[PDB]
Amino acid sequence: EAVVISGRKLAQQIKQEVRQEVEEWVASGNKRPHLSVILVGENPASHSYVLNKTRAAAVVGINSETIMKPASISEEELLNLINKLNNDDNVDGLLVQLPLPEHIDERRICNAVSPDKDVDGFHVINVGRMCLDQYSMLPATPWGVWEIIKRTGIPTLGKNVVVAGRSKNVGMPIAMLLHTDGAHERPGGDATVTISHRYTPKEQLKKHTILADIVISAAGIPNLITADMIKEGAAVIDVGINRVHDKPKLVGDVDFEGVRQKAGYITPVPGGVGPMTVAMLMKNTIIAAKKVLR
Amino acid sequence: EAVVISGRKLAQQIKQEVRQEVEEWVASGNKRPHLSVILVGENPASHSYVLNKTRAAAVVGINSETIMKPASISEEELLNLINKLNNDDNVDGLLVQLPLPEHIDERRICNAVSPDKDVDGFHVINVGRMCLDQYSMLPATPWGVWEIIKRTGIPTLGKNVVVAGRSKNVGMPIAMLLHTDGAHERPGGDATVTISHRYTPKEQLKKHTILADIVISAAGIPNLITADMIKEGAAVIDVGINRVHKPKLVGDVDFEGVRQKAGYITPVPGGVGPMTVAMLMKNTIIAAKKVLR
Numbered sequence: 001e002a003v004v005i006s007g008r009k010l011a012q013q014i015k016q017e018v019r020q021e022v023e024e025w026v027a028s029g030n031k032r033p034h035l036s037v038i039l040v041g042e043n044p045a046s047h048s049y050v051l052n053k054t055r056a057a058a059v060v061g062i063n064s065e066t067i068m069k070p071a072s073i074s075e076e077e078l079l080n081l082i083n084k085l086n087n088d089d090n091v092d093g094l095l096v097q098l099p100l101p102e103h104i105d106e107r108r109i110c111n112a113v114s115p116d117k118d119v120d121g122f123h124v125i126n127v128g129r130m131c132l133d134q135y136s137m138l139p140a141t142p143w144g145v146w147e148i149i150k151r152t153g154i155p156t157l158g159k160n161v162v163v164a165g166r167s168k169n170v171g172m173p174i175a176m177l178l179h180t181d182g183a184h185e186r187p188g189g190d191a192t193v194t195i196s197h198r199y200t201p202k203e204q205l206k207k208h209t210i211l212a213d214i215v216i217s218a219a220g221i222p223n224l225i226t227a228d229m230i231k232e233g234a235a236v237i238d239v240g241i242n243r244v245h246d247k248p249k250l251v252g253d254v255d256f257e258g259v260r261q262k263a264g265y266i267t268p269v270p271g272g273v274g275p276m277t278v279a280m281l282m283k284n285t286i287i288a289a290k291k292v293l294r
Numbered sequence: 295e296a297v298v299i300s301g302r303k304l305a306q307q308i309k310q311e312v313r314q315e316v317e318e319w320v321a322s323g324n325k326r327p328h329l330s331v332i333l334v335g336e337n338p339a340s341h342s343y344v345l346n347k348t349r350a351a352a353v354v355g356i357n358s359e360t361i362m363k364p365a366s367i368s369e370e371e372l373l374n375l376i377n378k379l380n381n382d383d384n385v386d387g388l389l390v391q392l393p394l395p396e397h398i399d400e401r402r403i404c405n406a407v408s409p410d411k412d413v414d415g416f417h418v419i420n421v422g423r424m425c426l427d428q429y430s431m432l433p434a435t436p437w438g439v440w441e442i443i444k445r446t447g448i449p450t451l452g453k454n455v456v457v458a459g460r461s462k463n464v465g466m467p468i469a470m471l472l473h474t475d476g477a478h479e480r481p482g483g484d485a486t487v488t489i490s491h492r493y494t495p496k497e498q499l500k501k502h503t504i505l506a507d508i509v510i511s512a513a514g515i516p517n518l519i520t521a522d523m524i525k526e527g528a529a530v531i532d533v534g535i536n537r538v539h540k541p542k543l544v545g546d547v548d549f550e551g552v553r554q555k556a557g558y559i560t561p562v563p564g565g566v567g568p569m570t571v572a573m574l575m576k577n578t579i580i581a582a583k584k585v586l587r
């Protein structure tokens with residue numbers, strides 16, 4: 001059977017690194033990091049994600065506040081709020097929980113967050129920097145996937161990788177990190193990467209996955225990955241977060257039970273990539289506090 | 295055997311569109327578009343590329359000037375010139391011929407060029423905008439590859455595409471254009487895209503090329519694509535520009551071999567190169583119209 005990778009345990013390790021980095025930072029006489037989270041409306045999953053972020057900050061000695069506004073907020077109010085936070089020298093990291101309501105321009109909001117406080121790395125300049133392999137605030141899911149892979153010691157250079165999904169904050173960034181030059185200012189994994197998405201024909205994915213040492217699935221489709229798609233021994237990183245009902249539940253992209261047999265490594269849902277996303281946000285927040293980048 | 299696609303011919307076509315578009319702009323009362331090129335040093339390829347660009351501009355009714363600098367120029371001197379041209383309201387497009395000397399930082403120069411004059415689309419905001427599928431000044435070579443494909447009627451949606459090479463102004467944007475959503479602000483290809491590079495093993499490139507409906511090579515490696523790598527009927531686009539031996543110029547494909555198996559193919563010379571220069575003209579009229587301001 002396949003080694004089940006523990007997202008909880010790895011996220012725990014990263015959390016400890018950060019807790020140590022924050023303590024030393026404060027001991028050297030610096031201000032304790034502060035993370036601000038703007039939460040809009042009342043999406044249940046959002047609300048729980050923000051609690052996961054606030055707990056993680058508390059456990060690593062980073063101060064936080066979630067500012068909850070109602071769905072009804074005007075895009076311009078939101079911009080004012082962000083502008084306040086951007087200007088408050090006590091806020092090191094600012095993020096805006098997604099999705100926002102249909103009447104708010106996401107991209108406009110994401111670009112209003114100061115790049116220097118952009119711990120989500122979703123600002124156009126951080127996306128640009130990332131895509132040029134420069135130092136940047138990396139988005140947290142991609143960074144988490146990366147860490148799961150490196151921390152587990154799975155090789156990437158020369159290897160073959162498939163990423164199912166091409167969203168701009170998850171799939172595309174994963175594909176960008178995995179294929180790029182280990183030698184660049186922000187190293188990448190030098191893999192051979194294939195990006196697939198909703199217009200891949202079922203057969204085409206299969207012909208690609210079967211060739212792949214690593215299959216990273218970030219499509220949000222239960223059971224998109226079945227055991228015949230993977231080649232024996234391959235690492236399967238399941239980035240899917242699918243709420244199904246039976247008992248409302250959390251399931252992945254992968255058929256966990258089945259692929260378990262075929263794969264050399266696999267990651268569970270829940271307890272897989274999710275905890276890592278949250279942990280990498282803590283890394284990004286101490287980076288922000290330290291003003292490395294600007 | 296392969297329909298050879300003349301990039302020379304398609305580029306002349308595109309230049310004809312641009313010429314009409316420029317004629318219309320001027321006849322409407324607007325300032326004639328002006329492109330400035332900065333050229334540093336003496337790379338002979340570079341000099342010829344600037345010649346190509348200045349000729350293309352002349353053909354399409356766009357004003358040009360090359361400002362040649364010795365390789366000895368400093369980074370700071372280069373930024374002053376760029377800062378000057380950014381501020382000259384007469385200059386609609388501005389490009390710095392690449393590559394630059396080692397003591398000058400490419401990224402920093404590329405980001406000094408005003409994003410609205412950046413007809414190479416290499417400023418970080420333009421890269422970012424492109425990578426988010428927003429309207430942007432698209433880089434000329436990838437846009438030209440896109441144009442070869444689209445005007446030749448080669449479908450992309452659902453297809454397999456390999457792009458060999460992952461450079462930031464050629465391979466990576468080609469992969470970005472080809473895989474992204476056809477529905478976004480800046481439409482992409484909705485293809486299934488595999489990116490390979492200097493560390494793809496030969497067996498591994500081949501295992502992927504063979505499934506490919508379109509293969510696009512931007513490696514700078516002669517005979518990297520051979521006919522047994524290619525699936526019969528596939529489109530093969532040769533981005534390579536390789537100086538071999540009188541001093542000769544070849545692509546990354548084994549043209550003679552590959553044309554016997556592929557359904558379309560592009561030659562070097564005469565394929566992607568002229569398209570690159572053509573798309574730069576389209577970017578310049580775009581810049582002059584201040585469409586994306």
Ligand SMILES: O=C(O)c1ccc(C(=O)N2CCc3c(c(=O)oc4ccccc34)C2)cc1
Pocket residue numbers: 164165166196197198199200201202203205218219220221224
């Ligand atoms: O209805 C079926 O019978 C059916 C089931 C599944 C597939 C499949 O395998 N797809 C389609 C969606 C998809 C794929 C992908 O690789 O990445 C995605 C990333 C994001 C969103 C959707 C995908 C590939 C095809 C047909």
Ligand SMILES: O=C(O)c1ccc(C(=O)N2CCc3c(c(=O)oc4ccccc34)C2)cc1
Pocket residue numbers: 048049050052053098099241269270271272273274275277278
């Ligand atoms: O054990 C777990 O499986 C698990 C632990 C933690 C999280 C979490 O809190 N996430 C990850 C997904 C996510 C987050 C988000 O903030 O916005 C999203 C917006 C859209 C889609 C997914 C997210 C943050 C999730 C799962």
Ligand SMILES: O=C(O)c1ccc(C(=O)N2CCc3c(c(=O)oc4ccccc34)C2)cc1
Pocket residue numbers: 458459460490491492493494495496497499512513514515518
């Ligand atoms: O005879 C050999 O020793 C040999 C020849 C060629 C390969 C090959 O196919 N390579 C390596 C270079 C390369 C590849 C690629 O896909 O993209 C590149 C994009 C940019 C630069 C170099 C590449 C793939 C392997 C072995």
Ligand SMILES: O=C(O)c1ccc(C(=O)N2CCc3c(c(=O)oc4ccccc34)C2)cc1
Pocket residue numbers: 342343344346347391392393535562563564565566567568570571
């Ligand atoms: O007929 C042809 O095959 C052909 C026509 C025109 C051109 C040309 O002028 N190019 C394309 C390549 C290129 C250009 C450049 O400006 O910088 C480069 C910097 C590095 C690498 C390639 C370029 C501009 C090239 C070939």
